[PDB]
């Protein structure tokens, strides 16, 4: 887990 990962919707299911 990275709180700074830039994907905004990609990682949401």
């Amino acid at each position, epitope marked *: 887990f990275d709180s*700074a990962e*830039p*994907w905004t*919707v990609r990682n949401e299911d």
Partner: antibody, heavy 118, light 113 residues
Framework: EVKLVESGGGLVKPGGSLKLSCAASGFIFSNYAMSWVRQTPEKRLEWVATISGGGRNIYSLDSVKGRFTFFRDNARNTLYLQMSSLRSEDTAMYFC???????????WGQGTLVTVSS | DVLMTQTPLSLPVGLGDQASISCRSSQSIVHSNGNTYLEWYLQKPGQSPKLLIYKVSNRFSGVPDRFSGSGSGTDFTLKISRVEAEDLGVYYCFQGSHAPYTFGGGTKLEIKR
């Protein structure tokens, strides 16, 4: 509907600077992360960076850190790539691309060509 | 970093025949959230790349069901059933699980006239 259009590409000398733009329409811009991906003259694809919807979180290639910066203007529906200290290895077609649920590069622009050469 | 090895480099197929393209990651590409962001792209002559397949086996909307993706571990495969002339171009695999994200070297699909 969804449209992405890059611009700013051109010939620059080694060590030079260039700013790329990417205009977006057809969606709520700030709801989506955007990426830069480049295609080399050898036709290889290379991810360069991804920036969050809000513009404050960025992943990028280590080899462009300290050279390239990435930012967006959400009030103007525009994504930017500020290049400096350009190298021959940077010569490529630069694409901007919008994410979607489940996928990294869902919509692509047409590209803008950057040539680094004396 | 994760190296993506794509084979074959080119693939001549008759119309109506099947094409199968392989992608091997140098290590595991399971994302921290448990998904595998393995994607396939097609670049037709003169055009930008376009998304075909995401999270290993999911077809992007508007993509014909002739295209399917499968795989696990470090081995992934794009299959085209009953190839059509519109399928011409270079296919690329891509992993978006571990930064820096990396593309396979591509496979050029050609028609055996």
């Amino acid at each position: 509907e969804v449209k992405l259009v890059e611009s700013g590409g051109g010939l620059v000398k080694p060590g030079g600077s260039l700013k790329l733009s990417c205009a977006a329409s057809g969606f709520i811009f700030s709801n989506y992360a955007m990426s830069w991906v480049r295609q080399t003259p050898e036709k290889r694809l290379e991810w360069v960076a991804t920036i969050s919807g809000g513009g404050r979180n960025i992943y990028s290639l280590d080899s462009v850190k300290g050279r390239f910066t990435f930012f967006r203007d959400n009030a103007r529906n525009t994504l930017y790539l500020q290049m400096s200290s350009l190298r021959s290895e940077d010569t490529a077609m630069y694409f901007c691309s919008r994410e979607n649920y489940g996928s990294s590069f869902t919509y692509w622009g047409q590209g803008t060509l950057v040539t680094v050469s004396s | 970093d994760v190296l993506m090895t794509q084979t074959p480099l080119s693939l001549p197929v008759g119309l109506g025949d099947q094409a199968s393209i392989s992608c091997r990651s140098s290590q595991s590409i399971v994302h921290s959230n448990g998904n595998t962001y393995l994607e396939w792209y097609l670049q037709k002559p003169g055009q930008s790349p376009k998304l075909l397949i995401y999270k290993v086996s999911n077809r992007f909307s508007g993509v014909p069901d002739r295209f399917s993706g499968s795989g696990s571990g470090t081995d992934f495969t794009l299959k085209i059933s009953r190839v059509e002339a519109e399928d011409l171009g270079v296919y690329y695999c891509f992993q978006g699980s571990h930064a820096p994200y990396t593309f396979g070297g591509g496979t050029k699909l050609e028609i055996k006239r």
